Amino acid sequence: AVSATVEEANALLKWKSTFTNQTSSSKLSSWVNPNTSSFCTSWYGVACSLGSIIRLNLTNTGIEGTFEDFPFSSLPNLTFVDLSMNRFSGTISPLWGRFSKLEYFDLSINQLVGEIPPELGDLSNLDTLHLVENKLNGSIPSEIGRLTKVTEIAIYDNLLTGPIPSSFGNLTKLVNLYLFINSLSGSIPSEIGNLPNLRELCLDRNNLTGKIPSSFGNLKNVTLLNMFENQLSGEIPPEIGNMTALDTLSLHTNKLTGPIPSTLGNIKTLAVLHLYLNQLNGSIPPELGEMESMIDLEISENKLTGPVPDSFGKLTALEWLFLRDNQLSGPIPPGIANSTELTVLQLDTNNFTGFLPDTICRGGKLENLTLDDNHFEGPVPKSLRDCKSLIRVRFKGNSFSGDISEAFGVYPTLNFIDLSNNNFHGQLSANWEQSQKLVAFILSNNSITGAIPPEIWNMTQLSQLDLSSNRITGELPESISNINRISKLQLNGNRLSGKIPSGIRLLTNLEYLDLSSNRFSSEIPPTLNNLPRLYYMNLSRNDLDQTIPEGLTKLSQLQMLDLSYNQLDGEISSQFRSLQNLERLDLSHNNLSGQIPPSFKDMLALTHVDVSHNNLQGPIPDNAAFRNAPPDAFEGNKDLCGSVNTTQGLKPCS
Amino acid sequence: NAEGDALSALKNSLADPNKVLQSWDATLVTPCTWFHVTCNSDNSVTRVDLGNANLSGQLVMQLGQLPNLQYLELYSNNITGTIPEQLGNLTELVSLDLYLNNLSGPIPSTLGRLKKLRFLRLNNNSLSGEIPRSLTAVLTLQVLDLSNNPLTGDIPVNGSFSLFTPISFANTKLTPL
């Protein structure tokens, strides 16, 4: 020992002298002259018992090297080996199997590649085995089954392949088995279900296939079970209801089928249940209401049918409830939202009908609520008017009705609402002014009338406004310049009137501008030339007037323009060359007059043009769009002559 | 899904002091209620326009798993790096706007896989290479413009590059004509 520490330390210095870049980490520099036991007292990461090495701890110390000159033949008393968080490279030598008293064996994050040598099976006294975060490949040897005293296996995030060995059935003292983020394959051995001490088993993110072994009914003390993102199949065995100590079962993103077994109601301690993205079918078992400690429940994206049971009224602690993207139908029970502390409710893309219950926000803590694409009807409840915690709300595609100014209230922390395709009527209120951090407001295709309150412009965090296909009236003020964060403004299909406000020119983030099918009647703002991001603008079907302003041709990023069904006049200018991105031009049904400029022989992006039913004359330009324009874009005009190949009802040009 | 995860990877690789990617939430099912991103009629992204928004950083290779994206706009920003090769996997793409940046490296040759492309704007950068000449294999190619970065060596005149003008490739150290 003390005399043998001579050879031990000499080998240790010889190994150390093989590293590279040791200068930065002067921590390992404390290895100095081997003498009468001074190194035990002064050498870092080393401990001796009775004068011989016992532990090698070198965490996070910046070492660089390999395991070529490791003294396998000089260290018969090494018992603890931890070399995590370094840059050791190479392979794992079989000689590692010759340490007779090794207990803790860690070779975590490193450069290690290659196989896993079978001879590690000789480690009769090994207790914890970590080979995490490496590039190991090959398979897992069956000789692992000879380690009858190991209690923790961690080999995840390597490049393993092949099947799970069946000899794992004899690892009779396992507790934690982590095999996630590897490329395993095959089927789960049934003997895995006969382990009397598992408490954590992770097989997620693999290519396991086949069916879950029903012997999983024998795992009487497992507290966690992850298998998501695999290729399982078959049906969830009913014996899965005897894992009576579970609190987190997740099996999402698989290829399972059949019905959900009712026996899941027998697990009192279950708190999380993930089963989305599968092919389950049938009806919800009422017994799913007998899980009194249930917090999260996600059964989205499946093929379930039938009614939602009333027994969900007994789930007092629910916080998340995901039922979206299914084929459930019928009415909605009052017990679905009974719980006080519910916070998310996701019920869209189903076939529900009827009225919303009167317990929607009973506890006053709801935050997220989606109901898209159902057949709900009637008025919104009144407990949802005074629910003061909403963040994201979606009502799109339904048949709610009532007064818009009476249906809602004030929401300090709302930032997204979508109420399109419904049957609300009334006038907008000024309560929306008090949602200061609101970002989107979509209210399209309803029966709303009235005028837009000035308070609607107090909002400066707004970024998308959509009040389209309604019966709004009035005129747009100048304080419209105040929003200035908006990038998508849709106000078409209404009865707005007056001038186009010049304040729009102060908007700079504007991308999408839809101002059509209204009764605006005044000159286009001659100062619209400071929109360096706009790519779409539709001002069709209006009562506009005197000649198009050339400032519109400094809209550099324009791609679609529609000045159609108006009372425009004059001549089209030659500044349209500057539009180097435009590819759609609807310019018909006006009094545009004169000749179409020839300089249009320069924009190669044009594909569709329409100048029909105007007062134009003269030859068409030499562009592919005019080359390939059907007859339906040239009628009604005076003297448009054309070429023989591009003959579409037009008189041959002289 | 997958488009959402690719766009989230793009978000993580950039820096934005103006907070223009604030709404890009990786928690939703689909990236169709995000701003500056437009989806198709059946939940598939078709435009990603983010130009003149003062972004700084590096592109990533995940941009290539947006199978149905038609428009890509990133011009007039402060991105540095090289153009990935996986951009050749965007089989249905019409326009590529990538100018007024600090891109480096060579132009990938895989850009010849894109048959429906109509607009290339890479100009005013620092790119160095040989104009791989596979671009003459797309044949749609209405306009191309790269005219401030050194691409020394040749201007191909295969069937495609026969209608262009010297105003492109200007100030680029080419001079084969």
């Binding site: 982590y178 954590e200 966690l224 989205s300 989606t370 | 928690t27």
Partner: peptide
């Protein structure tokens, strides 16, 4: 350190 896996949540709309 070595840890258990963690399951994410289903996407919302």
């Amino acid at each position: 350190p070595v840890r258990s896996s963690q399951s994410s949540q289903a996407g919302g709309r």
